[PDB]
Amino acid sequence: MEFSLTDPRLEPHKWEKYCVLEIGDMLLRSAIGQMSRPMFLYVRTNGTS
Amino acid sequence: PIGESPKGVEDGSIGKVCRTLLAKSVFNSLYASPQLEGFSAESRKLLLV
Amino acid sequence: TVSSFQDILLRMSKMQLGSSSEDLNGMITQFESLKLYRDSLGEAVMRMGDLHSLQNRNGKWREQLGQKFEEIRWLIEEVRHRLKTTENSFEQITFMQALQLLFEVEQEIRTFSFQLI
Amino acid sequence: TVSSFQDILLRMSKMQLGSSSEDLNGMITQFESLKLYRDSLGEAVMRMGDLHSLQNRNGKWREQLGQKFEEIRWLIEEVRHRLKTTENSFEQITFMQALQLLFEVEQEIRTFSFQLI
C-alpha cells in the first residue's frame, strides 16, 4: 500500500496490476491561498524471493 | 552532449553527466533482466564497428 | 505551479522552431493570458485581509464616541451647578473659561463624529 | 484651545491645593482624560485612512471572470484532442503536464472566486 497525489485514469495503461482508492484530502500550504487537492492510495499483490 | 530535443541537440555540464551516470546505474539495478545483458553485448560490438 | 509555467513554455518554444501548426502560436498566447490573469487575481484576494481588519478598528471608535458624549454632558451640568453655588471671583473666572472650552470641544467632537460615518 | 487646557488645569490645581472636594478631583481626572482624547483625535485627524487605495480598479475586474471561463474548457478540450492525436513522446509529456497545470490553476481560480464573493 502506497500514498500518492497523482490521479489515475489520466494515463491508465501504466497501472494494470493495481486497484486504486481515494482516501482523503490534503491542504497544500503555499505563500497565498489554499489548494485542497485529493489524495489516493495504490494497492498491489506481489511476492519476491 | 547529454540530451535530445526537437530541432537540435542539447548540452550540459559535468554535474549533469555525473547525475545521469548515477541514474543509469540505479535503473540498471532496479530493472535487471537477461534481455539487458544480451542487448548490451551486441550493441557494444556494433558501436565498436 | 508558477515554475510549471516556465517549464511548459520552455518546452513548447522548441516545438515551434522545428515545426509548423500555427496552433502552437494559438495556444502559446492563451497560456500567458491565464498566467497574467492569475498573478493579477493574486494580490486582489490578498488585499481583502487588510480591509476587514480596517473595518474592525472603525467599530471601537464608534463606541468610545458614545461614552464621550455622556461624559461631556454630565461634566457640563456639574460645572454649571458648581458655578451657581460658588461665591469667589476666582472660581467664576475659572468656570467661565471651563464652559467656553466645553462648548467648543463638544461642537468639534460632534463634527468629527458626523464626518466618520 | 490647548493654552486654555493648560491654564485651566493649573488654575484648578492651585484651587485644589487649598481645599479638597470630591467633584473638584472628579473634574480634574475627567479634564485630563478629555485632553488626552483630544490629542489622540487630532493625531488621527491629520492622517485619516487610505481611501485612495479603497477605490482602486474594480469594475471590469468583476467581469473578466466569465471571459476566462469562456476559454478554460475550450483550451482544455483542445489539449485533450491534441494529446489523443499526437505520436511523439516529447509532445505527449508536454501535453500531459499542461493538462495537469490547467486542472490545478482552474480549481485554484474557482476556490478564490468563491471565497471572495
Curated annotation (Swiss-Prot), chain A:
Protein name: Polymerase acidic protein
Transmembrane domains' residue ranges: none
Gene name linked to the record: PA
Record PTM: Phosphorylated on serines and threonines by host kinases, including human casein kinase II.
Family: Belongs to the influenza viruses PA family.
Compartment(s): Host cytoplasm; Host nucleus
Included stretch of the parent chain: 523 to 571 of 716
Subunit structure: Influenza RNA polymerase is composed of three subunits: PB1, PB2 and PA. Interacts (via C-terminus) with PB1 (via N-terminus).
Chain coiled-coil ranges: none
Annotated S-S bridges: none
Recorded superkingdom: Viruses
From Swiss-Prot, chains C, D:
Intracellular or extracellular location(s): Virion; Host nucleus
GO cellular component, one term: host cell nucleus
Keyword field: Host nucleus, Host-virus interaction, Transport, Virion
Principal subcellular localization: virion
Disulfides per UniProt: none
One of the protein's GO biological processes: exit of virus from host cell nucleus through nuclear pore
Keyword Nucleus (UniProt): no
InterPro entries, per database record: Flu_NS2 (IPR000968)
Effect of K84R: In strain: Isolate MA20b
Motif mapping: Nuclear export signal: 8-17, 81-90
Subunit-structure text: Interacts with protein M1. May interact with host nucleoporin RAB/HRB and exportin XPO1/CRM1.
Function noted in UniProt: Mediates the nuclear export of encapsidated genomic RNAs (ribonucleoproteins, RNPs). Acts as an adapter between viral RNPs complexes and the nuclear export machinery of the cell. Possesses no intrinsic RNA-binding activity, but includes a C-terminal M1-binding domain. This domain is believed to allow recognition of RNPs bound to the protein M1.
Assigned protein family: Belongs to the influenza viruses NEP family.
Name of the featured protein: Nuclear export protein
Classification lineage: Viruses, Riboviria, Orthornavirae, Negarnaviricota, Polyploviricotina
